[model samples]
Target: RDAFAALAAPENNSNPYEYMRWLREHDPVHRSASGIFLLSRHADIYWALKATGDTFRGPSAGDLARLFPRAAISRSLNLLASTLAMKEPPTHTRLRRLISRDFTVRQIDSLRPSIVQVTQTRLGNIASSLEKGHVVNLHEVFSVVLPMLIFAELFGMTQADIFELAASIRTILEGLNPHASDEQLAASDAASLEVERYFEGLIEKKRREPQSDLVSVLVSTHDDDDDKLSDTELISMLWGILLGGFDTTAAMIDHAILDMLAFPEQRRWLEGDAASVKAFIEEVLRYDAPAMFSSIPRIAQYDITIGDVTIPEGADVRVLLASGNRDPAAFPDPDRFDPSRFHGTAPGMSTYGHVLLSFGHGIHFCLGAQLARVQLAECLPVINARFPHLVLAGDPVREPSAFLRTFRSLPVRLDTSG
Candidate 1:
């Protein structure tokens, strides 16, 4: 109980791997004081993630309403639950099918030129700042800005629109942390209403004047009898995209940059080779997964056995994705950063010949996984090419949250004159 308590402490968040490692070895399936079950081992986490709909279920509207009883808070929670990530199948299947085509490998490949252009543009801005000997926060300049730009382009939003939306989204996301303050929760509720209004306006515009963007595509999607998405559903989809796209991708980029700077030899190995860079990104995903813990909270629908332990019905099960990535049984020398483990293989492939669970496992797996990869694949190598002398200026300040593995700020010195 003491060890579990320590895991939730903010200080332990900075270096959670050691704690997770201990849990993986000693208490792989732990029941906390709150009655939530935490799964640490790779196999156990994987099994739980794959058990959706039968033994496990995603949170429902009723669940969210109960948690946040305030009018605005409940509205926001209901809106979020409408997203595919929060829905169980049949409904999840239909919603995913509508947008899945846009994220396929071939479709994402077509956007590479634009992604590269955006990345190079951001790199140029960073180089300009570094030329003046300014230590830039890479998390802000590159990680955050690049993804925002890409998302803006995809959503057909202007720079100003993206800026406003991002702010509101961040506020709403902060409320997801169980430890958030009353003030923070109120801010999130207010931001949720603001974002909904913004999306309502944008959807109306898209309907009137269609463009070559995701919003336009979604606006035009319908069936033979004109069975299309309702206004609320459209807003919910946009909300989900805003919530999922930027920070998650930014976190991945931030962690990858930090890992490369920390390991010069590994960085050099990835230099100038596109294939090696791709493999390195995969290794990064496996090594220090962007999401430290699973964001999706699962409730057991019935008693289920994951490994030797049986989870009782109604138990909240949380999968420690970061721990699973470093399970020694899955990846030998799990503590070390090795790109070779993912080399000469596909994006999600691991050393154990199984798919890495970073993006996730079952039906609720990330819909934007390919887009995030495309952004990283284009962004990281350019940084390596442009700033050969890049080094950490100071220790990164990580966000104090149990669910996410994100850096609030990462200062780095970049010497562009190579």
Candidate 2:
């Protein structure tokens, strides 16, 4: 029953639902044996995000030093802190204002054509694979590859660069885990440095000659006055958005496809318009999140109480957002994967101002989120409609991660005869 010791336990990692279910009920505000305050339940997580003062915020560099102690971070971790998602006021305010000028709903919506084209084209690849009587590796052909292709366009990244960045970004994410070996950390550092150089080159190219991509637009972005994103901010922002935009959405699409396959009746939702498809996607986002737990922990600035538990200043807290999404208080039949439950914009915490809390809340809420849904909405419904009788070939082989919930091989066959 030691929560911290359960950190790498098989049951806790493989089937987090049960573990989180207990945590949410018995110990809504839990402390891992190592002292990380793990916040579960909808109310407490909301309170933390809605926490609007110096009382709680993303950890600053100094705070991270104490939190991480003598860590080996030189780039990726530092880049994470610099990104828009991890920043507090003033600096966050500044960078976001400039980014908002370009990364708008209008700008996000503009990618619809490309998203539509890519989804159509990629599914055709899967269809072709099916024609050859081959079982599709769900993650490879469908989920993982979709976002990478789309992001290549988003960043105006070359196919070669996109492929390389995919490996580098994932390695960096793996390195974030406490269990990552020395070789893995060293490899992650090299990847972190490689990404630094790659983006630097991309930014320089965009500066010299503009293009139609988001990176190009951001290269010369100005908020209102002469304020703009610095080179460091620009580099960090690109990787941050890529990581945020790619990882979660890829996993969401994976869930979206698997949800359709598992629930025969639920496929009806995809049989209609964009509105219904979007609703289905929202439920998937809430139900099976991309990350098991948050990649970064929120560092406390002062003594704080959540769910009747007090966390002293400097205590690092990780919100069990996946658990929060499954809270009974916030959601009815929290275990049931019912997209219909969201028939009329159920009082979701934040998506569409929809009760979904996975993307986060308040100022640090993910900006690339809208783009994520755009990818899912365009892709998920299309695939299910095409492969109505898709069958899970066997059990999926998933790479166990304490932070991210991703698959190594989710194999399924496109049984078109349905």
TM-score per model over all chains: 0.92, 0.91
Cα distance off (Å), candidate 2, residue 103: 0.6
lDDT of each: 0.79, 0.76
lDDT of 1 by residue, 88-122 (tens): 87887777776664445776676678788988887
Clashes of each: 0, 4
Model 2: lowest-lDDT 10 consecutive positions: 345-354
Error of 1 at 159 (Å): 1.0
